[PDB]
Structure formats: structure tokens, C-alpha cells
Amino acid sequence: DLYFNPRFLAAVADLSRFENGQELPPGTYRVDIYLNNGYMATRDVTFNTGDSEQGIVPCLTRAQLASMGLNTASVAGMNLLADDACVPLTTMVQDATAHLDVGQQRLNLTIPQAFMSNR
Amino acid sequence: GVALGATRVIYPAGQKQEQLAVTNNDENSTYLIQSWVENADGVKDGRFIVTPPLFAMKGKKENTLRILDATNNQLPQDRESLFWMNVKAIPSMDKSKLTENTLQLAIISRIKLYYRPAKLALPPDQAAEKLRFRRSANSLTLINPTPYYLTVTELNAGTRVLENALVPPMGESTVKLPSDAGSNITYRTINDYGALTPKMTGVMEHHHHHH
Amino acid sequence: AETCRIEAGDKQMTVNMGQISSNRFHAVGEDSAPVPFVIHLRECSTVVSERVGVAFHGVADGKNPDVLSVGEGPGIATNIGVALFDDEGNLVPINRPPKRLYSGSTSLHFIAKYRATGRRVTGGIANAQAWFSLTYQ
Incomplete structure (x- = not known):
């Protein structure tokens, strides 16, 4: 229950998102990426509309996750994906989380150690 | 807000x-x-x-x-x-x-x-001192030889308060000078942290080799 | 130094303009009752708030580009726009090319009025939007 007057804008198609409590519309944002509280990288990440509470989800490829230490053979079905496919992280990787801290422009990822590179 | x-x-x-x-x-x-x-x-x-x-x-x-x-x-x-x-x-x-x-x-x-x-040699807080002034019958010109934009405020000619001026690096800006404006010029600037630099005495532009 | 924190009389920067009565207006240029509003510059030193540049913008009216449009659509009033006035009682310019400096006070006082752009005003919905810029020294 929010109202923003659309005459203040104009791509005002993003207005309903804000009126429904969302912080950030889909787009490509410069973010600091963290995985299990370890700093990974600072780069542009594309955020598409998705099933998250935030209304948006980051597009992370198999290769980009492997570049963060993910042992991709340990993740069932991951090998079936295409190279450019946005990994459905929170459903494919058991117990994994992704959240964008919008105020800090910081993408916080978590992935259980069972799936990371160890021993 | x-x-x-x-x-x-x-x-x-x-x-x-x-x-x-x-x-x-x-x-x-x-x-x-x-x-x-x-x-x-x-x-x-x-x-x-x-x-x-x-x-x-x-x-x-x-x-x-x-x-x-x-x-x-x-x-x-x-x-x-x-x-x-x-x-x-x-x-x-x-x-x-x-x-x-x-x-x-x-x-x-x-x-x-x-x-x-x-790699600018001049410290930012040493820039304000470098300002120079040129006076005409009805205007005052501020002369900035530094590489910084100078935001000049509390600009006074005698007791007459003048307009603020934004003086571009290696350049000049002109403000109006009321006819009753006094002789000694004083000024301050807004620094990198948005605070006032000390009140300073305006130095006039001079000829070659001259006081 | 932080910039000033900006608020109006109303938390959401709104002004209730009141209802339109066509009988109030018998000539182009005639105005409604004044509706004051105030722009507050809070939580900042005098160094920051002094000589702040203020400029107004908005969708200008077609018959009188010096006043705010109330738009067009079903139910929307016609032959009125919204005029803005400063603390001298003078009409505030809107949508001017990329000045006006304010000093001595951290409250900026204004008045809004409905202004007839045609001899024959029709009533109904009369909303307007404007934005002002505060340009810091």
C-alpha cells in the first residue's frame, strides 16, 4: 500500500514494484560480491525479475560460481545447465542463499561447505 | 526527509x-x-x-x-x-x-x-591564498591561477558585501562592485570538506616586477 | 558537511489545494485563495544553508507556461493552472534554462493559488506536481 505519482517519472513500468515494497528494479548493478562472508569480487551483476522476496535475483553462471570455489560436480543437475544459464541458486544448491543489500550494493551469497572445494 | x-x-x-x-x-x-x-x-x-x-x-x-x-x-x-x-x-x-x-x-x-x-603540487588548502583581484569602475574580477575551482564567499569590498563567485581554475570570474565599495578587499572560501577557510586580505593583480 | 535535510509543512511534501469553484473566476488571471507552504532546510550549519540556489520546475500549462498544469483527462478541471508565489508575493518562474539565491533563513515561504487560464473555468480534479532544486555553494 504505497502510492508514487507517475508524473514525477518519464519506463515508469517499475512503479508498481516500489508501491509493493521492493527496493530496486531489475537491471545491471555494480556490486561487491561476498560468499560465506568472504570477499569475492567487485563487478557488474545482472539482476532479473525472479521469485525472491526482493523481486529480483542475480544471474550467476556455473562458471562464475565455480570461480568462487563451488565444486560443481557436487551439485546435482548443475552439469545439465547451459554455460550462459542463470543458475537457480537457491533451489539447485541445497540451503544456498542470495540477498542484495541495496544500500551497500553488496550481494551476499551463502553456500554450505558440503558443496565447496575442500580437503 | x-x-x-x-x-x-x-x-x-x-x-x-x-x-x-x-x-x-x-x-x-x-x-x-x-x-x-x-x-x-x-x-x-x-x-x-x-x-x-x-x-x-x-x-x-x-x-x-x-x-x-x-x-x-x-x-x-x-x-x-x-x-x-x-x-x-x-x-x-x-x-x-x-x-x-x-x-x-x-x-x-x-x-x-x-x-x-x-599530482597537483599545490595543497588544496593553500589555493585560497593564490587568488588575485582586478578592479574596474563598477566591477571586481577574481583571478585564479590555481588548478582548483575556488568557491569564494564572504567577499567584501570595504564594508560592502559582494556576490559569491565560483572562480574556475587558471581562469577568472567577475562580480558587481557598488559605487560606494571600499578599498580593502577581504574574502573566505569553502574548502573540500564544505567548511570556511580563514578570512584573507585580497591582493591585487600587479605589473611585471612590481609591488 | 552534510547537505540540509529537506521537509515541507506536510510529511510527504503535499499541499491541499481545496476544491474548485467555477464562480470564483471571472477573468483570465484571477486567482483562488492562497495556500501557503514552506520548505524547511534542517540539520545543517549556516555555512551550508546560506545562499542556497532555489529553482522550480514542473509540467507547465499550455495557455500560461508560467503556471503548473493540472493535466487533462476525464473528470479533470479545465482553464485553471497552479501558480506559485514567493515571500515577496511575486510569481515564481518555472522551467527556466540552467538563478535565485536564498539567505538569512532556513524556512523558505511560498504560496500556491489556482489561476484561471480562461474566462470560463470548469471544476473537478485539479492535482499538480512540481519539483525544486537546492543548489549548494
Whole structure:
């Protein structure tokens, strides 16, 4: 229950998102990426509309996750994906989380150690 | 309501980004925040990328804007370049007010963005001293030989308070001089941290080899 | 130094303009009752708030580009716009090319009025939007 007057804008198609409590519309944002509280990288990440509470989800490829230490053979079905496919992280990787801290422009990822590179 | 974290931004040449805080102090309000850069003439210039360029913030909150240098090293590297950071705060409105004839306002806060090359020998806080003055029958010209934009304030000719002036690096600006303006000139400046530098005595422009 | 934190009389920067009565207006240029509003510059030193540049913008009216449009659509009033006035009682310019400096006070006082753009005003919905910029020294 929010109202923003659309005459203040104009791509005002993003207005309903804000009126429904969302912080950030889909787009490509410069973010600091963290995985299990370890700093990974600072780069542009594309955020598409998705099933998250935030209304948006980051597009992370198999290769980009492997570049963060993910042992991709340990993740069932991951090998079936295409190279450019946005990994459905929170459903494919058991117990994994992704959240964008919008105020800090910081993408916080978590992935259980069972799936990371160890021993 | 919304405030910004600083009244000017100094962008160091070579830095991948600079940042600027945006704050809201009211728990019971949501603002849309829309941000962009203009060149010196107040025209949009995308060569500084502001991100995220559109977002909502709810309640007592601080959000950080990223300012990215996308000028491809095309600006001068011996003097500052002036840009303007723009942050527009757009309030929500109570739905009850939809049944009322309403004027609603949004507010754009505008602050200087100075692109500052590397390796300037003159310390920023030594610049104000370098200013020089040229006087005509009805105007006063401020002469800035430094590589910094100087924001000159509390400018006085005798007891007569003059207009503030923004004096471009290695350049000049002119203000009006009332006919009753006294002789001794004094001035201050606004520094990198948005504070006043000390009151100084104006020194006049001089001829070669001369007092 | 932080910029000033900006608020109006109403938390959401709104002004209730009241209902339109066509009988109030018998000539182009005639005005409604004044509706004051105030822009507050809070939580900042005098160094920051002094000589701040203020400029107004909005969708200008077609018959009188010096006043705010109330738009067009079903139910919307016709032959009125919204005029803004400063603390000298003078009409505030809107949408001017990229000045006006304010000093001595951290409250900026203004008045809004409905202004007839035609001899024959019709009533109904009359909303307007404007934005002002605060340009810091």
C-alpha cells in the first residue's frame, strides 16, 4: 500500500514494484560480491525479475560460481545447465542463499561447505 | 526527509569509483531516489555513471550511491573539471490524499562534483591564498591561477558585501562592485570538506616586477 | 558537511489545494485563495544553508507556461493552472534554462493559488506536481 505519482517519472513500468515494497528494479548493478562472508569480487551483476522476496535475483553462471570455489560436480543437475544459464541458486544448491543489500550494493551469497572445494 | 552525505564530491583521477551517502530520517516514509550527473552547464552528462540510478528507501536508512568514472581519460590532467551531482527525492503520498486536490513536491539536491587530476603540487588548502583581484569602475574580477575551482564567499569590498563567485581554475570570474565599495578587499572560501577557510586580505593583480 | 535535510509543512511534501469553484473566476488571471507552504532546510550549519540556489520546475500549462498544469483527462478541471508565489508575493518562474539565491533563513515561504487560464473555468480534479532544486555553494 504505497502510492508514487507517475508524473514525477518519464519506463515508469517499475512503479508498481516500489508501491509493493521492493527496493530496486531489475537491471545491471555494480556490486561487491561476498560468499560465506568472504570477499569475492567487485563487478557488474545482472539482476532479473525472479521469485525472491526482493523481486529480483542475480544471474550467476556455473562458471562464475565455480570461480568462487563451488565444486560443481557436487551439485546435482548443475552439469545439465547451459554455460550462459542463470543458475537457480537457491533451489539447485541445497540451503544456498542470495540477498542484495541495496544500500551497500553488496550481494551476499551463502553456500554450505558440503558443496565447496575442500580437503 | 532526505539529505546527502556531503556538499561537494572530490573525484580523484584514476579511482574506479567514488561514493555519496543518501539518508532518510523518518521511519514512516518511503522515498524514490533518482540520481544523475550534469556537466558544468547543468546538462546531463552520462560520462559519470551514478548507480543505482533509481531505488526506493524506507524509513530511517542510509543508502550509498556509487559514482563511476567513465570519461575515458578525456578530461584535462592539469586542472579540475566541474560537474554537478543530482539526487532527486520523490515522496510517496497517502492514498487518502488521492480524493483531495493536491500539489505535491519533489526535491533535487545539487552538489559540486570536482574531477581532480593526480599530482597537483599545490595543497588544496593553500589555493585560497593564490587568488588575485582586478578592479574596474563598477566591477571586481577574481583571478585564479590555481588548478582548483575556488568557491569564494564572504567577499567584501570595504564594508560592502559582494556576490559569491565560483572562480574556475587558471581562469577568472567577475562580480558587481557598488559605487560606494571600499578599498580593502577581504574574502573566505569553502574548502573540500564544505567548511570556511580563514578570512584573507585580497591582493591585487600587479605589473611585471612590481609591488 | 552534510547537505540540509529537506521537509515541507506536510510529511510527504503535499499541499491541499481545496476544491474548485467555477464562480470564483471571472477573468483570465484571477486567482483562488492562497495556500501557503514552506520548505524547511534542517540539520545543517549556516555555512551550508546560506545562499542556497532555489529553482522550480514542473509540467507547465499550455495557455500560461508560467503556471503548473493540472493535466487533462476525464473528470479533470479545465482553464485553471497552479501558480506559485514567493515571500515577496511575486510569481515564481518555472522551467527556466540552467538563478535565485536564498539567505538569512532556513524556512523558505511560498504560496500556491489556482489561476484561471480562461474566462470560463470548469471544476473537478485539479492535482499538480512540481519539483525544486537546492543548489549548494
